[PDB]
Amino acid sequence: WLAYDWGLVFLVAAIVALGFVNLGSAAPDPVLLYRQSVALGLGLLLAFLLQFLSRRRLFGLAYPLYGASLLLLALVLVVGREINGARAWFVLGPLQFQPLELAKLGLLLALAKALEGRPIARVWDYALPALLTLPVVGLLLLQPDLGGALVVLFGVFVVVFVRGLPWRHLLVGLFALALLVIGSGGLFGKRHTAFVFSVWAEEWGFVGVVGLLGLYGLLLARLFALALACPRLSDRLFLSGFAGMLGFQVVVNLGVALGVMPVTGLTLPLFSYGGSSLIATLAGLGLVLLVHRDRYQD
Ligand SMILES: [Cl-]
16 A cells, blocks of 8 residues: 655655765775665665565564574674674675674564553563563673664663653663764765765765754654654554664764764664665664554554
8 A cells, every 4th residue: 555654765765875975985996886786775675575564473573583683693603703803793605694683673573562561560660671681782792792782772771761661770781881892065075984974074064964964863853753653552662762773873973973982883874884784774664664554553
């Protein structure tokens, strides 16, 4: 039927097109743009394939996907490939799959589903999110990769806070974990990650950064608007956790790019270089779009 919110689609497409028109000038290379074109193709294809999935099945898979992401996080520690001092990637030749993304989505689904029963015992308000998040954050710290750990923990914080459970301990853990880590016009196109962002910030200047931060602000706004437009509470929680994680990566790259936090492996979603991050962001956006399209169904 295609009863989606096409505004969010246009926002995602606009950020993606900005990322692509920037990469073609921010340290370009004939062979480095092909990888990202194929990543975009795979991402759109996967986000389309996932549209043949009802939300009932998707939340039926809330617990199996969480278990598979836990076991996959455990397995990457044994048979992974070290990159920047941590084994956090599965490399099978041309295939590059990082279990962090599966962990994020599985935990969001699992917590959303397990946290939609309004009455709870007076003890599990602390323990259930604890015992569902701690294995993930711990297996993320054994790599070690604390950027994804921060994203995961902050997502869990957003889910808990929107729900209405104890969240202050989660912020304590979050802040504690984060401590052990050219004009108005610009140039217009005239190897670390932040280079992808430093070239946009310098070749396009204040209008460029204002426009990009505005695109991200509108995306987070539309996500949180779709979140409170769902009758079921599990959907509200899932959408808000996703939007939280996205905004958190964005503000992390903000402080990384402007000399605040030490850099992490967290890219700017839909914008920074990275085929797996692009594909995973597209897949998560496909999930959020399909859970929004099925909001008035049983
Ligand atoms: Cl609290």
